[PDB]
């Protein structure tokens, strides 16, 4: 079973950590701050890890029920189901819920409501809303998250979903860190069955990220989330499951329309790529580009510089 | 050779909404016609209407603000391409790609980031609707005109909007998923539109994926019914398999048993026929999935659903 990419273009690709389009490519220089994202991390046989799912809706989205509040600042407190419905395992092996972000900061979005049972069923209402992955209330883990909500008058304990738009710094200092891990379960635990750190080893080789500007709701935060491999190559991988042939996948960056190679990449086993380059360099790409697979290389592959 | 990817229904994205697909619904045949302009796809690959390949796109418009007027729809968004570029009126689709396909308010949240010399990087963002009954919803001529909360926190600057539900407007404009909205101004038709979709064969209904997406108020279900979801036409524009015939039969199988457990036509452009009479929705086991069979035409008996 031969390995494959799917073929498409920047603008055709959707970021595995935000529901947006991917922007651009960027390579980072090599730091001592860790790369651990939970979601958009799939093996290249297409085996899913983290939190990761398939659904460009489920990234960064909640499902679940309000059931109480507090008196807090993270006021609504969230029960949390899985994101197609069915019951939230605690023990199961992941770090959280599979869609829960995977940084530190806050999410803003909107919540809606449908009510069921014997309170006006059928009964809805959508506001604006704010989950913050600083809050001690947010312990997805656990089973739940709590909310901030712009009208604490008109909201229940009914099903609810969260739709995430962007995110922002909070706005008593907490910073928004994309590759800084929230507590999934809380102050004072620490994360489980998370999906590996990732770093390039080879000397001269850095990241390369897929990179989208996401929305903000204040301020002049970039929105700067960067993704490991795109939405649609995760999913392309777990339909396919091709058996991986080497640690490493040797890939070309290809003009189409030119039919030249532009530069050239590692797509390792586990869902990363390196590149040679020393530097953070936004690339300059033509639009029509896209990745091809090349063939079956290993971790001592000596790439062209970029 | 042609083929489906192989995803469950709630591994399916809504191709008229960004949600997930709730499930299988057939419809009794009326006089009104379906002609969905997002969600359209050939079996070779040819995404038709307003379709485009992400499930961000659906509902969502990109653009400039660069006026506002005195109407209930104040704010004049100039709109893009969803990619950023620049629009073309000229170019053979109904509206800009990712232009909602019926009457109704989409409701979701306008963000914006400054460009240029004033407070460049400067962003903001808030609740707002789109209504496509409105007269200046006017997409295809590139422009939509926006309500939103706080009219005193929003520039002339690029704009997103973010879709997250739909609703009835008030004062009697209520959410119709099968009336097209006017794409250009009232007393203009609407142009290269996906064709309309019909059974043909006696016997035969439309099958269609059913999302109950969320509402802003009232009792509206919030029912979008799309003929095949976004990670099908996902999958036929990377195979662009050429098509055999007109209709690729297709099993619905439950995997681990094994066993078929109906029958289904794909037609070459895009749409899903089954033999029922009524409207039905669907009760299957949550592991199911569509298989292609093989080539048949038009003249094929279904086994009954």
Same mark, same amino acid.
């Given at each position: 079973k031969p390995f494959s990419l799917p073929i498409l273009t920047l603008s055709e690709l959707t970021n595995s950590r935000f529901p947006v389009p991917i922007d651009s490519l960027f390579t980072a220089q090599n730091n001592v701050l860790q790369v651990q994202c939970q979601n958009g991390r799939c093996t290249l046989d297409g085996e899913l890890q983290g939190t990761t799912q398939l %659904? @460009?809706?489920?990234?960064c989205a909640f499902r679940g029920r309000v059931t109480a509040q507090i008196?807090?600042? $993270?006021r609504w407190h969230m029960q949390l189901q899985n994101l197609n419905g069915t019951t939230y395992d605690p023990? $199961?092996?992941? @770090? #959280? @819920? %599979? *869609?829960?972000?995977?940084?530190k900061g806050v999410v803003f979005g909107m919540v809606s409501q449908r009510n069921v049972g014997?309170? #006006? @069923?059928?009964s809805t209402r959508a506001q604006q809303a704010w989950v913050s992955t600083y809050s001690p209330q947010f312990v997805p883990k656990l089973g739940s998250v709590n909310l901030r909500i712009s009208d604490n008058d008109d909201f229940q304990f009914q099903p609810t979903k969260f739709t995430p738009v962007g995110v922002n710094d909070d706005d008593d200092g907490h910073p928004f860190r994309q590759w800084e891990l929230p507590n999934y379960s809380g102050e004072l635990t620490l994360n489980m069955n998370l999906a590996p750190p990732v770093a390039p080893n080879f000397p001269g080789e850095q990241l390369l990220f897929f990179r989208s500007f996401v929305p903000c709701? *204040? *301020?002049?935060?970039?929105?700067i989330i960067d993704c490991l491999i795109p939405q649609e190559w995760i999913q392309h991988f777990y339909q396919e499951s091709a058996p991986s042939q080497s640690d490493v996948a040797l890939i070309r960056y290809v003009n189409p329309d030119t039919g030249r190679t532009l530069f050239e990449a590692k797509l390792h086993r586990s869902g990363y790529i390196t590149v040679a380059h020393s530097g953070d360099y936004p690339l300059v790409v033509p639009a029509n580009g896209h990745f091809r697979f090349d063939s079956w290389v290993n971790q001592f592959y000596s790439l062209a510089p970029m």
């Open positions: %659904l @460009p809706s489920g990234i008196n807090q600042r $993270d023990t $199961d092996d992941v @770090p #959280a @819920p %599979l *869609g829960t972000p995977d940084f014997n309170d #006006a @069923p059928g709701s *204040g *301020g002049y935060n970039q929105g």
